[PDB]
Design a binder for this molecule. Structure first.
Ligand SMILES: Cn1cc(-c2cc(C(=O)NC3CC3)cc(Cc3ccccc3)n2)nn1
Length: 111
């Protein structure tokens, strides 16, 4: 059983995983496979990896106790992208676009 605010969070999560946003959301679907992508410095730079499949598992397991906790993981995911990558990288442009979707809908949280 999810609170009203956590149902809004679950709605946002479903939207971020939906075909509507797939053109720029796909790098965030699964944990970064550093070894597969040849990013051998990734886990030296990013101490707390996060991705939408991990957010989905935590939501399904009722790990998040409130909207703030959910938003902290979604923002951690974007912050990791902005920390690791040069600001002109294609993946950063995709992060910016998905974060715009997130922030504008998160701002419509019911009181
Ligand atoms: C979530 N995530 C993925 C990546 C990442 C980082 C790199 C990368 O080589 N970064 C430079 C700094 C060393 C490459 C890719 C693959 C790729 C390429 C073009 C467009 C979307 C994805 N994804 N970062 N964070």
């Amino acid at each position: 059983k999810l609170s009203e605010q956590l149902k809004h969070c679950n709605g946002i999560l479903k939207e971020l995983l939906s075909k509507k946003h797939a053109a720029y959301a796909w790098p965030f679907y699964k944990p970064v496979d550093a070894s597969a992508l040849g990013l051998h410095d990734y886990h030296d730079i990013i101490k707390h990896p996060m991705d939408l499949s991990t957010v989905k598992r935590k939501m399904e397991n009722r790990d998040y106790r409130d909207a703030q906790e959910f938003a902290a993981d979604v923002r951690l995911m974007f912050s990791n992208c902005y920390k690791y990558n040069p600001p002109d990288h294609d993946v950063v442009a995709m992060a910016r676009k998905l974060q715009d979707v997130f922030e504008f809908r998160y701002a419509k949280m019911p009181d």
